[PDB]
Amino acid sequence: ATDDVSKAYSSPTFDAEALLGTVISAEDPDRVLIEPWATGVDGVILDVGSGTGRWTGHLASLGHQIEGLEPATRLVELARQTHPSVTFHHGTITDLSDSPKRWAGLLAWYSLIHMGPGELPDALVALRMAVEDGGGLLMSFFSGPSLEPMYHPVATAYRWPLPELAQALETAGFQVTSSHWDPRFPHAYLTAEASL
């Protein structure tokens, strides 16, 4: 559940600064995925579960209009001191439904990995209501042949088969425009477009 997960990430026994990192490496393979996507966003990007803000600051430095959303108290505060010119919102995905705010695109980089079938559905719905119609979504997650839990050092994670996740997205108002996954690893990612 997000409550226990968020406090696990803000736990003083977890130094995200060193583990997650506060700056992106020039050799980071995710750059070729996120950077191109970001350029395609015509408006303010919302980095969902920005954590230490490493990608938020990186994209902001490259001229992108972007803000962050992070429920982990220690992390969001940490992100502000590290990236003083970037706006970081302290809150959860569901909190987004409490405001009329809407962004042009959504970046959820491994921020949805701790949500199972009883939680992701509602999160996707809130996300859809937080992005402009036709707006984009880039998310990375863990996939596999079955929808099942998976050990993770911070909090329990979940593997989501493409069929189940794509259906959840469609039900939520998102259409998958691209996806990628290598069966030898759970790591996977996809792009979607806000629709009906």
Which residues of this chain interact with ligand SAH, rule CB under 6 A? 2, 5-6, 9, 20, 48-52, 54-55, 69-72, 75, 92-93, 109-111, 114, 123
Tell me the residue type at 141: F
Instruction: Tell me the residue nearest to ligand SAH as measured from the CB.
Output: 49
Segment (H or E) for 178: strand 174-181
Site for a second copy in 41-100 (CB under 8 A): 73-74
Residues 92 and 123: their CA atoms lie apart, in Å, by 9
Question: CB 147 → a second copy: shortest distance, Å?
Answer: 16
Q: Is 186 in the site for a second copy (CB under 8 A)?
A: yes
Q: Which of 127, 157, 165, 192 binds a second copy (CB under 8 A)?
A: 157
Q: What is the rounded CA–CA span in Å between residue 136 and residue 132?
A: 8
Instruction: Please report which helix (H) or strand (E) contains residue 162, including its range.
Output: helix 162-172
Residue 146 contacts a second copy per CB under 8 A: no
Report helix, strand or coil for 184. Answer: coil
> For residue 178, which phi and psi values (nearest 5 degrees)?
-165, 150
Give the residue with the Cβ less far from a second copy, 73 or 87.
73
Q: Are 68 and 91 in contact (CB under 8 A)?
A: no
| Binding residues for a second copy (CB under 8 A) | 2, 4, 7-8, 10-13, 15, 17-21, 25, 27-29, 73-74, 110, 142, 150-157, 182, 185-187
